[PDB]
Write a protein that binds this ligand. Structure first.
Ligand SMILES: [Mg+2]
Ligand SMILES: [Mg+2]
Ligand SMILES: [Mg+2]
Ligand SMILES: [Mg+2]
Lengths: 198, 193
């Protein structure tokens, strides 16, 4: 039985696409899906030259990931899936970037206690967040970016997807990913003549 | 309908060697057509080994052979050259060239192409067709899978039989999906070859 371990920050549009893909895969393949939290804010800590404006666009970027960690600590890893879905629908599908509102709405949607929102503005969960992030994102390259998935235990950057594959198409892309994971002496495949629009 | 692999190679390149031998393994277990095209490590180095400082020789001979006898001769000429360089570790390139032309059944006079710029434009045109990228510059190996250009699969060993076939099926799946861009291992990197 194949296993997808996926690290996400609700803010990340790449994570959003790749996680929606994995959920499509799960509809047409027998796989175990484990979500884990990582943090774009932590990625950004490790970059001394980040421009002021980009820092400003991330002013309160710890809130959603703190709440996700706190939810997992309180209720188990199982609640990450639906909490992430509720948050990401609002952030990515509705374009809502008032994160305080996204957090309270998403907890209610997911059926989780409202008090979890208080995690967003406390450092109590940061040690756990850092450890979760490092487990997922530690890589040997200076690329260090999202999306990162482990396929049957094999850590990858990508698949970098700019649209969510659906149904059996999603399944076939999973099958291909598993085949590459199964061959230890494969390292990289990348399109050269086109790139994702951002 | 028929799956097609276009493969850009410099006889000197170990990564081209591995990925091209993989494609020839694929051809034994999947119905595919394989087309070889020349590129040049020396050109990559312009736009940026013991025995190999004269790095234009093998690629110049390859291009000259294609110009005179057609691109189909590149498969056996490359096999001849790379068998010697990579499988036998022969780095005397003048000897590799002579021997490989004889292996492939091509005229010995083609060896003279190694030390003439007569087809360097043809070489450059072939190179850029294979190596051009919209993003950051890429290295070897580059291929087209059913018309879709990829860097990689970067492979450090040659998959054989159905294992090779499954890796092709995977590549074809990724090529077929327009909105897939990259998959890369994060905890191991290719060996220093
Ligand atoms: Mg976890
Ligand atoms: Mg500003
Ligand atoms: Mg504290
Ligand atoms: Mg050609």
């Amino acid at each position: 039985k194949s296993v997808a371990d996926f690290w996400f920050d609700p803010l990340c549009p790449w994570c959003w696409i790749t996680s929606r893909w994995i959920l499509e895969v799960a509809k047409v393949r027998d796989i175990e899906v484990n979500f884990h939290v990582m943090s774009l804010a932590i990625l950004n800590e490790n970059r001394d030259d980040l421009p002021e404006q980009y820092r400003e666009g991330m002013a309160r970027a710890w809130g959603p990931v703190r709440v996700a960690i706190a939810a997992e600590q309180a209720h188990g890893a199982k609640v990450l899936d639906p909490l992430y879905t509720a948050m990401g629908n609002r952030i990515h599908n509705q374009g809502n970037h008032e994160l305080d509102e996204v957090i309270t709405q998403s907890l209610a949607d997911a059926g989780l206690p409202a008090e979890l929102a208080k995690a967003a503005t406390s450092d109590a969960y940061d040690n756990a967040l850092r450890k979760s992030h490092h487990a997922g994102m530690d890589a040997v390259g200076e690329d260090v970016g999202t999306p990162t998935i482990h396929v049957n235990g094999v850590a990858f950057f990508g698949p970098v997807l700019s649209k969510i594959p659906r149904g059996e198409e999603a399944g076939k892309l999973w099958d291909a990913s598993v085949t590459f994971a199964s061959y230890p002496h494969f390292f990289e495949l990348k399109r050269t003549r086109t790139e994702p629009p951002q």
